[model samples]
Target: ASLPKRIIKETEKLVSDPVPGITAEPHDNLRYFQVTIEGPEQSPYEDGIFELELYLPDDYPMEAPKVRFLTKIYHPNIDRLGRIELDVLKTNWSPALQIRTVLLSIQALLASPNPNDPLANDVAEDWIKNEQGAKAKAREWTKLYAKKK
Candidate 1:
């Protein structure tokens, strides 16, 4: 089947009026895409370029798109597998939400780095017990993996 009109519109808008720190391009599959996000300033991940993959489901709008980091990142809410645990992408998902909003939320997640509710338990523990150390590690990881060429 052909891709939905909503997907086409969203993709076109993404290319035309792209977000400041994020860019996405559709793949040959059309429903799959590659994304890049520039790390937010003043955050541990600052000055880094993070890659991500996004897939719109056949039942998108009714279901949340599946997204995962393609670059390694040290954050409590993002696991080793790059899977993110965020309320807006999970139980709180609404049909009204669009891809731009989702990507913006992901960027915000990078900025905030919530340790209170985490997908990586050990990272969260370190964040709670030794925030400075955790941030150091995050910066190190960003330098090693997400640094722009």
Candidate 2:
């Protein structure tokens, strides 16, 4: 499979210009990129390690890549099978936005969980009904599931 020129350049910059708090590497095919975004500071998910897989389909750049959580994070925007309902992956993607930018948004998502958007409804309502307790449980989930090896 031939790679796009833009994809090649983006890959180079992803390696050369590393985004702080994120790590990304590619599969041999270069279509599937593995990404790890550390939980943002002062956030409930802090001190946890998060891994996500970004898959660039043949129609990428025209169509957005599929990004899924590989790590178990207890956030309303994130679901049981690692589904993410972030807007950037949905209606907000553009060729102008690189994978690294996408990664940035994921980090920002961790910065502030958006239960208002509500991907995992149960998680969302838990956060809605008791925001404080929700964060406490989220932190615990982070520590328990996202422990670095």
Candidate 3:
């Protein structure tokens, strides 16, 4: 690690200047995080925790951070692995994009799911079949996996 400043900076900011509806707690490794994002209001995933894991790669801050879903949910934009199809991580990665920004993007994704450019083909197909039906399934999944123990 040539420099840890970037990692520490991000980690500190992530703790003190957190994003709304999201939380990232660092442990084991500075670059890895125990992430949690609350479901957006009026959305299918409207209640409970949506646990996630985020790891900034070796070339992170240059390359995009890797985010994995710990909770299963029915969504076209996210695969079974809870990996997301994020446009910002692809096209907008830059020196300016912070972990907070990454989270907000994911939160926004939950709020306005883009079935047009979907990652989970099976889930997307269901979305394409019927919009209302897709929301119902998402709600069912939320109730199942996004519950408090």
Better of 1 and 3 by TM-score: 1
Q: Using Cα atoms with residue i matched to residue i, what is each candidate's TM-score against the true structure?
A: 0.94, 0.92, 0.89
- Look at candidate 3 and give me any clashing residue pairs: none
lDDT of each: 0.89, 0.84, 0.84
- Candidate 2: clashing pairs of residues: none
1 against 2, candidate with superior TM-score: 1
Worst lDDT 10-window in candidate 1: 113-122
Which prediction has the highest lDDT against the true structure?
A: 1
lDDT of 3 by residue, 54-93 (tens): 8888888888888888999788888877888887778878
RMSD of 1: 1.4
lDDT of 2 by residue, 1-149 (tens): 57899888888888788899888888777788988888888998888888889898899898888999887778888887888777788788988788887889889988978778724557888798998999998888888888562
Q: What is the TM-score of candidate 3? A: 0.89
Instruction: After superposing candidate 1 on the true structure, give the runs of residues whose Cα lies further than 4 Å from its correct spot.
Output: 118-120
